[model samples]
Target: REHWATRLGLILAMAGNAVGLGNFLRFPVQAAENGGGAFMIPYIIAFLLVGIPLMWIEWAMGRYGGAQGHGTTPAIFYLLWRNRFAKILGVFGLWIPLVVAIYYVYIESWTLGFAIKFLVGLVPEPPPTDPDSILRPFKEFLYSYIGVPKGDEPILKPSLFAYIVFLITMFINVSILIRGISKGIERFAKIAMPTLFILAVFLVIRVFLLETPNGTAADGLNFLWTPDFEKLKDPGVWIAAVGQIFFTLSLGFGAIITYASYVRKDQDIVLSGLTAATLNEKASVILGGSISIPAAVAFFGVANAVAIAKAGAFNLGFITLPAIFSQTAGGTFLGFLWFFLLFFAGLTSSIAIMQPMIAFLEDELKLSRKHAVLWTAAIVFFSAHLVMFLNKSLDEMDFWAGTIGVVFFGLTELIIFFWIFGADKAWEEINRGGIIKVPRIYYYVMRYITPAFLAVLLVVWAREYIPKIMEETHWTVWITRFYIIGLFLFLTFLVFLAERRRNHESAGT
Candidate 1:
């Protein structure tokens, strides 16, 4: 029910949501594996055709529903199609993001753990100056610190320090939410978001200037940015690019709809929405693209850097970057800045992801925002234990809720908003207060291009993931699946309550 204090603050906060860990972690690597600058060919097309159009629809739908006293998608989607089943579709809007935050905040804490390690001088600069020697401490700093299996170790147990850092991160995440949007999210983004950009700019500059004995920055840049033109012929490549746009921008998670709900009527969704997307896109492509992988190739040489990148994103940031910095002048301070900014990236994103549940509590259950934040925080914290201690739970949740369900949810909403709700009506809503009107072509683009793109993406995603899902027989994974199912059922029950309240109010009228 609260409003953003200013347009700039709103843009920064939305930017914070989009300029996520993906910018640094997965985006660059995905670009390389899919053909470097060649990847951008379909990537840009998907952005214009899918990202821009979906961005506008979410903004339009959110503001439309918010004006009528709804913030979460349960009520937002229900109001759109004027059908009860739409609220069931809305459940994905709730379940996916809320489920993601349970595991995500744990990952967010790792950024702080790594940053603090450099700050406290645990990962000291030096060691024989040999590459292997330089890598040892940083490697232990990652492998030993996180409670990874000692190769043959049977049980999974996180360190006490990991729990301590996670608790501290959770404290920050919820305390900010308690401040509400204007004073909390807006102020946080205003300062935190800009600081991240400043940190990243300096770090990126440092990466570009590095003259490693074994590798050159130009080699790294070319390795990451040069296109393999022939790769564009593959349908799989285009779909992969579209998937990157989806996760990179938080399309299906319902956070945008929740954030956009707070915009004052007569505000420009057109420019603001596009600005947020561009902010995210540029950060991912230009800034993020220039950082980790490029830095890796510079310090480790292309072959080893390629190996490090494929080892995992977690490896690239925690292990490789620290090792890279171990050899640089002022290495300790730079290492601290790198992970510190990463923490900011994850923090703002985690806050945005968690807000939908907070909004749901306040708007649907009539709980105050303060109470809502505390309750949501408590639920997420308790649930995060599964993600923390249980083997494979985080990966299980990531693939299902974070990756696959996101596409399904985004596509479902796109269909509901443009097709079922009527594209012409949605277009009118999108341009209601526009400064620069969307091109007339997007009228058909949303109706034809965007949803079809997502449908193809959905098929690609399933084909890529389903066999892997079928092969998994771990009890931990099954437990996680059931846990996700329960979350959906519980949310659906709450929707039934909202429907009951609506009917009761209608009867009284």
Candidate 2:
């Protein structure tokens, strides 16, 4: 009933989760946008403090809790309900995940749609040349092909058809879950994730072939390595770096815990989580970036690479990369190969996102896997539709859940472990038969240093939001901002309320 069928399968599943659209789509652009090469300054540090620590904490907690045999919510609530505050803190443990499930499915649909188009032998237009140039060709392409119609504005938004795709994705997810974890989840990852890597490598090599920039792929390589440090000094840069690693690794939320719970007791999760987080992200960085930036450079030159990178999630894989691949490979076989790569990447990551919520329902509420899968999928379907139907406003849904939620959850878990449970005790839990001993300095990171960094960055981020109040574009900014405020308040209220009720129930008060 618990433990991985094989360690390799577990690593692939966890690694698959880490090597998501973010690694492939976001990482290169972020590096391009933040500091080019220099952005790695904060990113590397964030990886150590924010990414590595949070990754270890999340995976360790999952293994410990999984060994205890509860699902994600129960594990967080069980451990945290010792005090009234702990219970309060535990509520977000599940809520943040629900938020992610809602919107991530929508974004995944975008990738799925693009891949399907490639399968059907379709290619979109080139990216706009001028940075401020209206993206008329791309906008028309979305409307004519994808179902979003341009109105008063030139840009197209989400179409309802997108949500239909999302609904189908949920059902597909339920189908996998009902089949059981190892057979369905682990088996799928083993086959799909590796195949995805192979396909991505092939595309990367193809992209390298297209590079005729003065007989050297140097321009393509240059766009990636050239440093841009302006963002490195911004409060947002560190926040983005740390948040990116945590969110990409599926840390803070209880998904990994539920997954790890199934692993054999003697399995080495510390190494696995580290390896999964590091290696999968490396795949995303090297392979994923290699797939994207080179093609982007070859298509629109380096400046367009800068613009596309800054476009955040929108210009990532769906809109930009496909067009590049379409033009590069050219013909039906090319389309087949391109989307075949994307579909597996999308499906693998999608499964990882759904796993936490699906497992939690089964364990915490005594629902059958059938019932839990159905219930969670249905909830996510309709709820995510609400966001998708209002696509413009809901774009921020990505940032709110993706950025703030991950950081908040990571910090919350650290508070529970280092502060509430006590660092010495938590370290003992981590090092107990752990493949590697917890370094003495890790305690310092978990205790004073890590929390301090998160707190200062969080506060500085708050203060910096003030100037946005006066800007015209701030209207759009507020969409994400207000969503975050609501998320914080909602999770805050739910945590305390859950804590109070659970404690009273436990105490027989």
Candidate 3:
């Protein structure tokens, strides 16, 4: 079996894979929207109740699969449950990452482009006016770069600069993947994780030190920490908290499963999994929470900061955060630092999302590692183009693959592991080389509470998001749906072909 060269490398890689834009961008906005410290109540609850358990579960599955020389989830699920349907559902693990990574690489490119723009002083300086007015240039910037039209005008072709950054980002991903696990992924994570943490620390300090025209940093602190206890009464807040925990930890993405597949059998996943979860939470709450919201409050005041939080994470990260940088002291340097921080955050994650499929190709289909990496890259390059050229495709993909699909996969896998594979067996696997013994109570939690939690999330999402999605009857929606169907069919065909080959080889043997 391929093993992590060093324990530290393995831990750092896991941490890096879990710590991404969600930690920095998504968490802060969700916290602010959900009544800050009030949100933390359910957030911490979800972490212990749902997140950590799932982490151990995924690690256990990955290590078990690796022991049998498998990497991707479909085959892994088949091993655990001995059911063909389990194999098909396990396809979500591969499919979501495969789909999400395509467009995610495009989003990652924006950070790269913004970083270079900041370094070269190409970012426009916000006018010293109302905070609402400051949002216009950022929106315009996004529109112009992505080929969206103003008023009744026709859509322009994507800017040349956009394609350049996109290619550069893809090249970085393939280059890193070609280096193999120990030398490539593990090495990059060691450097990227520490650097990301330091950069986050610097930005938080910068945000806290700054004083806006009308409000102080303390006001931002109050805005963030002053719990609206009443918000706890709202079901949506609990949903938001759990959703944040799930998404923030990179649970159900198949990346963690793939990463853990490289672990040596005797390695203590219990302790390592907890450490990664803890580090990710620190990055999200302590470091991530300290940035954007406070900076926005200081620059734009509380009302505008709240407005920015409600505007969505992408707007908060790209539009508002950069706008905040432009108005600050040493704006250019600070802007570069902020965007580069995002770029690193994105780079680590984008590399991770590809590994499960790459490993699957090499291990299951007997493709060379280079061939696996290149083929995966080719698929992503083509798939990602749909999102790059069309705004609706990006949003649709994000909603389905990035959000809803993950929870579905998590719920499905946990049921298969605990119910079909049996809790006693899973518990044993989880404890097999552990520094800390997982409490027996977690077995029940994994068997019952975690699935229940995911079920609630899925129900709430369908109740809330489905109607909204139904309203999107534009040509783009039809186009995206067609694309999604075609992608699924192609993946299913590949799975069937691989199964056929495996069956034939076994028969000959």
Cα RMSDs, all models: 1.8, 4.1, 1.7
lDDT (Cα, tens digit) per residue for candidate 3, span 44-76:
889999899999999999998888899789889
Q: What would the TM-score be for candidate 2 when compared with the true structure?
A: 0.86
Ten-residue segment with the worst summed lDDT in candidate 2? 128-137
lDDT score for candidate 3 against the true structure: 0.84
Give per-candidate clash totals: 0, 9, 0
lDDT tens digits, residue span 1-509, model 2:
54568878889988876676677666777776765566667877877877777777766677677766665744555574466565455656666677777776666666666566657656454543342233444544555543453454323356565556666767676777677778888888898877887887887777787654432345667766666766667776776677666766777656676677676656776777778887766786678767677777776777767788787555645556555444443633564566567656656777776777666666554568878777777767766644654435455555556666667767778878767777777777766667777667777887888989998877776578624533534355464456545655755664455446656778996
Tens digit per residue, CA lDDT, model 1, 1-509: 68999999999999998888888887877776676667878888888888888889888888888888898888999887888789898998989898989988999998898888788877744565677777767777776666776655334577788789999999999878889899999999999988988998998888888877777777877886676778788877887787788888988899999999999878899999989999998888788988887788887788887777767767777877878877767788898999899999999999999999998888888888889999899989998887877777888888778888887888888888888888888899999999889999999988987778778767766687588676865555778888888889999998888778868988999
Residue 429, candidate 1: alpha-carbon lDDT: 93
Candidate 2: C-alpha RMSD to true structure equals 4.1
- Summing lDDT over every window of 10 consecutive residues in candidate 3, give the lowest-scoring window: 148-157
- In model 2, which residue pairs have backbone atoms overlapping below 3 Å? 3-262, 3-263, 4-262, 4-263, 35-228, 37-227, 62-257, 88-495, 88-496
TM-score-sorted candidate list, best first:
3, 1, 2
